[PDB]
Motif scaffolding. Structure first.
Motif, PDB file in Angstrom:
ATOM      1  N   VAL A  76      -3.464 -27.128 -18.691  1.00 56.15           N
ATOM      2  CA  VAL A  76      -4.589 -26.890 -17.791  1.00 56.15           C
ATOM      3  C   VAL A  76      -5.917 -27.251 -18.443  1.00 56.15           C
ATOM      4  CG1 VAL A  76      -5.864 -25.043 -16.677  1.00 56.15           C
ATOM      5  CG2 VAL A  76      -3.444 -25.240 -16.329  1.00 56.15           C
ATOM      6  N   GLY A  77      -6.179 -26.742 -19.640  1.00 53.96           N
ATOM      7  CA  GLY A  77      -7.427 -27.036 -20.315  1.00 53.96           C
ATOM      8  C   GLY A  77      -7.207 -27.671 -21.667  1.00 53.96           C
ATOM      9  N   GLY A  78      -8.241 -27.723 -22.490  1.00 52.14           N
ATOM     10  CA  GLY A  78      -8.105 -28.311 -23.805  1.00 52.14           C
ATOM     11  C   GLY A  78      -9.465 -28.588 -24.408  1.00 52.14           C
TER      12      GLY A  78
ATOM     13  N   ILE B  93      -2.111 -19.695 -25.245  1.00 49.55           N
ATOM     14  CA  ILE B  93      -3.399 -20.079 -25.810  1.00 49.55           C
ATOM     15  C   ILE B  93      -3.170 -20.383 -27.283  1.00 49.55           C
ATOM     16  CG2 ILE B  93      -5.788 -19.448 -26.190  1.00 49.55           C
ATOM     17  CD1 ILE B  93      -5.504 -17.396 -23.967  1.00 49.55           C
ATOM     18  N   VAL B  94      -3.128 -21.664 -27.634  1.00 46.20           N
ATOM     19  CA  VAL B  94      -2.867 -22.114 -28.998  1.00 46.20           C
ATOM     20  C   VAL B  94      -4.186 -22.545 -29.616  1.00 46.20           C
ATOM     21  CG1 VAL B  94      -1.418 -23.579 -30.430  1.00 46.20           C
ATOM     22  CG2 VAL B  94      -0.654 -22.906 -28.171  1.00 46.20           C
ATOM     23  N   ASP B  95      -4.437 -22.115 -30.847  1.00 49.74           N
ATOM     24  CA  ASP B  95      -5.705 -22.372 -31.520  1.00 49.74           C
ATOM     25  C   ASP B  95      -5.419 -22.701 -32.974  1.00 49.74           C
ATOM     26  OD1 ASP B  95      -8.968 -21.391 -31.213  1.00 49.74           O
ATOM     27  OD2 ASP B  95      -8.159 -21.488 -33.222  1.00 49.74           O
ATOM     28  N   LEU B  96      -5.783 -23.907 -33.397  1.00 46.16           N
ATOM     29  CA  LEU B  96      -5.559 -24.341 -34.763  1.00 46.16           C
ATOM     30  C   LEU B  96      -6.878 -24.754 -35.398  1.00 46.16           C
ATOM     31  CD1 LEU B  96      -2.458 -26.625 -34.064  1.00 46.16           C
ATOM     32  CD2 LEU B  96      -2.495 -24.181 -34.458  1.00 46.16           C
ATOM     33  N   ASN B  97      -6.936 -24.645 -36.723  1.00 45.42           N
ATOM     34  CA  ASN B  97      -8.104 -25.036 -37.496  1.00 45.42           C
ATOM     35  C   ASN B  97      -7.657 -25.696 -38.786  1.00 45.42           C
ATOM     36  OD1 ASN B  97     -10.368 -24.195 -35.921  1.00 45.42           O
ATOM     37  ND2 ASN B  97      -9.944 -22.074 -36.500  1.00 45.42           N
ATOM     38  N   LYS B  98      -8.616 -26.334 -39.450  1.00 49.88           N
ATOM     39  CA  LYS B  98      -8.436 -27.006 -40.727  1.00 49.88           C
ATOM     40  C   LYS B  98      -9.817 -27.312 -41.272  1.00 49.88           C
ATOM     41  CE  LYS B  98      -5.353 -30.397 -42.823  1.00 49.88           C
ATOM     42  NZ  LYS B  98      -4.840 -31.787 -42.696  1.00 49.88           N
ATOM     43  N   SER B  99      -9.946 -27.344 -42.595  1.00 48.74           N
ATOM     44  CA  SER B  99     -11.253 -27.561 -43.189  1.00 48.74           C
ATOM     45  C   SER B  99     -11.099 -28.142 -44.584  1.00 48.74           C
ATOM     46  CB  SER B  99     -12.066 -26.266 -43.247  1.00 48.74           C
ATOM     47  OG  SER B  99     -13.226 -26.437 -44.039  1.00 48.74           O
ATOM     48  N   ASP B 100     -12.232 -28.565 -45.137  1.00 46.71           N
ATOM     49  CA  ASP B 100     -12.308 -29.155 -46.470  1.00 46.71           C
ATOM     50  C   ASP B 100     -13.772 -29.134 -46.874  1.00 46.71           C
ATOM     51  OD1 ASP B 100     -11.947 -30.687 -48.846  1.00 46.71           O
ATOM     52  OD2 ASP B 100     -10.234 -31.689 -47.909  1.00 46.71           O
TER      53      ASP B 100
ATOM     54  N   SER C  89     -22.030 -33.914 -51.718  1.00 47.14           N
ATOM     55  CA  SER C  89     -21.299 -32.932 -50.931  1.00 47.14           C
ATOM     56  C   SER C  89     -20.420 -33.649 -49.920  1.00 47.14           C
ATOM     57  CB  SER C  89     -22.242 -31.963 -50.214  1.00 47.14           C
ATOM     58  OG  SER C  89     -22.765 -32.551 -49.039  1.00 47.14           O
ATOM     59  N   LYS C  90     -19.453 -32.910 -49.377  1.00 43.69           N
ATOM     60  CA  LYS C  90     -18.555 -33.409 -48.344  1.00 43.69           C
ATOM     61  C   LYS C  90     -18.245 -32.275 -47.383  1.00 43.69           C
ATOM     62  CE  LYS C  90     -16.214 -36.871 -51.189  1.00 43.69           C
ATOM     63  NZ  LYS C  90     -14.988 -37.124 -51.991  1.00 43.69           N
ATOM     64  N   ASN C  91     -17.662 -32.634 -46.238  1.00 43.86           N
ATOM     65  CA  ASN C  91     -17.254 -31.665 -45.229  1.00 43.86           C
ATOM     66  C   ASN C  91     -16.280 -32.343 -44.284  1.00 43.86           C
ATOM     67  OD1 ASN C  91     -17.270 -29.082 -44.143  1.00 43.86           O
ATOM     68  ND2 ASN C  91     -19.506 -29.000 -44.037  1.00 43.86           N
ATOM     69  N   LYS C  92     -15.380 -31.562 -43.688  1.00 42.35           N
ATOM     70  CA  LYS C  92     -14.386 -32.066 -42.752  1.00 42.35           C
ATOM     71  C   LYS C  92     -13.821 -30.897 -41.966  1.00 42.35           C
ATOM     72  CE  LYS C  92     -10.250 -34.939 -42.487  1.00 42.35           C
ATOM     73  NZ  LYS C  92      -9.403 -35.936 -43.190  1.00 42.35           N
ATOM     74  N   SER C  93     -13.584 -31.097 -40.670  1.00 42.84           N
ATOM     75  CA  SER C  93     -13.003 -30.051 -39.844  1.00 42.84           C
ATOM     76  C   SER C  93     -12.219 -30.679 -38.704  1.00 42.84           C
ATOM     77  CB  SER C  93     -14.075 -29.114 -39.283  1.00 42.84           C
ATOM     78  OG  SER C  93     -14.888 -29.788 -38.344  1.00 42.84           O
ATOM     79  N   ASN C  94     -11.197 -29.964 -38.238  1.00 47.58           N
ATOM     80  CA  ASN C  94     -10.367 -30.413 -37.124  1.00 47.58           C
ATOM     81  C   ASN C  94      -9.934 -29.197 -36.322  1.00 47.58           C
ATOM     82  OD1 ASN C  94      -9.476 -32.588 -39.508  1.00 47.58           O
ATOM     83  ND2 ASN C  94      -9.832 -33.484 -37.489  1.00 47.58           N
ATOM     84  N   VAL C  95     -10.463 -29.055 -35.109  1.00 48.07           N
ATOM     85  CA  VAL C  95     -10.215 -27.901 -34.256  1.00 48.07           C
ATOM     86  C   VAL C  95      -9.444 -28.365 -33.030  1.00 48.07           C
ATOM     87  CG1 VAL C  95     -11.294 -25.917 -33.129  1.00 48.07           C
ATOM     88  CG2 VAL C  95     -12.413 -26.997 -35.064  1.00 48.07           C
ATOM     89  N   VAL C  96      -8.450 -27.579 -32.608  1.00 46.74           N
ATOM     90  CA  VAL C  96      -7.660 -27.862 -31.409  1.00 46.74           C
ATOM     91  C   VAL C  96      -7.452 -26.556 -30.656  1.00 46.74           C
ATOM     92  CG1 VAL C  96      -5.402 -28.475 -30.540  1.00 46.74           C
ATOM     93  CG2 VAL C  96      -6.457 -29.919 -32.183  1.00 46.74           C
ATOM     94  N   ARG C  97      -7.850 -26.518 -29.385  1.00 45.68           N
ATOM     95  CA  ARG C  97      -7.536 -25.412 -28.490  1.00 45.68           C
ATOM     96  C   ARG C  97      -6.909 -25.977 -27.226  1.00 45.68           C
ATOM     97  NH1 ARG C  97     -10.154 -20.744 -29.268  1.00 45.68           N
ATOM     98  NH2 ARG C  97      -9.966 -20.386 -27.013  1.00 45.68           N
ATOM     99  N   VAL C  98      -5.844 -25.338 -26.732  1.00 48.15           N
ATOM    100  CA  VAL C  98      -5.198 -25.742 -25.487  1.00 48.15           C
ATOM    101  C   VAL C  98      -4.833 -24.506 -24.676  1.00 48.15           C
ATOM    102  CG1 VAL C  98      -4.290 -28.018 -26.064  1.00 48.15           C
ATOM    103  CG2 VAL C  98      -3.079 -25.982 -26.775  1.00 48.15           C
ATOM    104  N   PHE C  99      -4.649 -24.718 -23.373  1.00 50.01           N
ATOM    105  CA  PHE C  99      -4.241 -23.680 -22.434  1.00 50.01           C
ATOM    106  C   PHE C  99      -3.064 -24.221 -21.640  1.00 50.01           C
ATOM    107  CE2 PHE C  99      -7.709 -20.505 -22.525  1.00 50.01           C
ATOM    108  CZ  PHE C  99      -8.632 -21.180 -23.285  1.00 50.01           C
TER     109      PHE C  99
END
Ligand SMILES: CCCCCCCCCCCC[N+](C)(C)[O-]
Ligand SMILES: CCCCCCCCCCCC[N+](C)(C)[O-]
Ligand SMILES: CCCCCCCCCCCC[N+](C)(C)[O-]
Ligand SMILES: CCCCCCCCCCCC[N+](C)(C)[O-]
Ligand SMILES: CCCCCCCCCCCC[N+](C)(C)[O-]
Ligand SMILES: CCCCCCCCCCCC[N+](C)(C)[O-]
Lengths: 250, 153, 46, 51, 51
Positions: free
Chosen positions: D9-11, E3-10, D41-51
């Motif tokens: 349904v969502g995401g 409701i699935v929720d994932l994360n990751k970082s660096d 410096s460095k930074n990185k992120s990966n977020v996932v939400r689903v319904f």
């Protein structure tokens, strides 16, 4: 909907800048590049030196997904609320502001198989001023938003560019002392020079498609592989299996 | 829509300026280029020297892009909101100002294939006064805008 | 300055193809993750 | 949805990668002493939400 | 409803950053990468290290 955001920067400062006061034998005083001399009478000359060389880069790709039917308005919303305390006496109220990503769409199939949409896109975030000053503790979240309202018509599976924004800049200053800044080996202590450069790109893209089949594999099968891999799975518990056997019946 | 902005500057100061007071044997005093002498009676002569030579240059090219259909009004908006706390008692409110880039267009095709538009352009930013004085911490964002409303083809 | 033009064709290459080249070049790509590929396989179906 | 099947349904996804580099203009290029003046410096992120 | 929720970082920071003031013989003073010098006149150089 795709929201692509790129940045780039450059910066370099190198040089000095003289500004100070002096007192010569309690009968005459000499200032230099100032306006007020009396409150800085007991001070001395200041030679502010700057040396810096900075690079920068930042990419952000965000994507909301929403599913609906023909001729049905749908809403996706991902916001943030900020509550403040207006200490009145009569009509005391909790006033609030709201900012975040928001789509409202109304899809419709044409006669050829293309999908026409009536869009209302908002993408906002919180701009932050300097943290050292007092205005970071009161109710001042400077909000910057981006609003787009239009109508587009895309074929099935293709894409269109709805919005966009670019910006390029380049500044450079040069200061010096008029005669001392041209000396061969001593004149570097009196010049000053700065630079700046930036390149910003934001775009908004739309890609609709038609759903005819359910998910494969099932939603309860892809979750059981996430819980087993990350280590959060508790379907083997001796105490919780008496009740979780009702929910995990399929 | 293209918004091109260029600047250039030049500056040079060189010279002195004498302004001070003196006291000669507690019976006569001499001032020089002043108005008040009594509150500067214990001070001395001041020879304010200035020496500076400055160049400057700045280019800014900004460009918003928007897509719409025939005879349909569309809006692109990129603004910034500033919230202030008016501490009243009755009609307590969060008052706000808003400034930023904004286009509202209404395109239409003519008979020859030309595109006539009804434009409403705003391009604003935040002008900053001197940071050392107290008026940088209160609700004074001096806003400068630029408004254009016309019809072109 | 104002410069209008008429759009008759969609984007080439696709919007989901130019983004996968940005994430691979900048190093923010996470489509090869062992844990997040169980759910990102629904969104990246095309 | 059919009976027993499922639908998304969502995401929401989000990816990011930033990196800064600062230095002193001349002292930052010394062979064995220049490490005391650079910064990165460095930074990185990966977020996932689903319904 | 799932409701699935994932994360990751660096994250990685490594380097120094010099910012301080000095006073040389009560007749001339040298600042470095600052704006206010008077309220930091009695202080010294600061080499903020991050790791
Ligand atoms: C502050 C003291 C620095 C004064 C600089 C001397 C300026 C002399 C001007 C000579 N010239 C050829 C540039 O005109
Ligand atoms: C403080 C010392 C300032 C030195 C300035 C010398 C100026 C020389 C003028 N001129 C024409 C001979 O070049
Ligand atoms: C004293 C700290 C600043 C030194 C000035 C260095 C300027 C360098 C000029 N140049 C052409 C050699 O690059
Ligand atoms: C603070 C003191 C550090 C000053 C660094 C010296 C800069 C000299 C510039 C030489 N070069 C070739 C980079 O132009
Ligand atoms: C504080 C010490 C700063 C040392 C900087 C030396 C700069 C050398 C300039 N140059 C062109 C010879 O490389
Ligand atoms: C002093 C504390 C910081 C030391 C700087 C270490 C930088 C390391 C650079 N490098 C290439 C060797 O990794």
């Amino acid at each position: 909907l795709w929201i692509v955001d790129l940045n780039k920067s450059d910066l370099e400062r190198l040089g000095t800048s003289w500004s100070g006061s002096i007192t010569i034998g309690d009968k005459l005083g000499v200032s230099l590049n100032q306006s007020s001399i009396s409150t800085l009478d007991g001070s001395r000359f200041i030679a502010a030196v700057n040396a810096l060389e900075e690079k920068k880069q930042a990419t952000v790709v965000s994507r909301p997904v929403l599913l609906t039917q023909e001729n049905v308005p749908a809403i996706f919303d991902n916001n943030r609320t900020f509550y403040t305390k207006l200490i009145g006496e009569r009509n005391v109220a909790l006033e609030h502001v709201t900012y975040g990503t928001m789509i409202r769409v109304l899809p419709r199939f044409s006669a050829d198989g293309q999908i026409e949409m009536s869009l209302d896109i908002e993408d906002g975030n919180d701009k932050t001023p300097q943290s050292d000053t007092t205005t970071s503790v009161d109710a001042l979240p400077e909000v910057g938003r981006t609003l787009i309202s239009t109508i587009a018509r895309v074929p099935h599976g293709k894409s269109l560019l709805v919005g966009g924004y670019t910006r390029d800049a380049n500044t450079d200053t040069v200061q010096s002392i008029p005669f001392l800044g041209k000396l061969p080996l001593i004149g570097s202590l009196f010049r000053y020079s700065s630079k700046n450069k930036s390149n910003v790109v934001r775009v908004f893209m739309i890609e609709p498609k038609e759903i005819v089949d359910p998910l494969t594999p099932d939603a309860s099968e892809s979750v059981n592989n996430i819980l087993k891999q990350s280590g959060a799975w508790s379907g083997d518990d001796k105490l919780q299996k008496w009740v979780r056997v009702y929910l995990d019946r399929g």
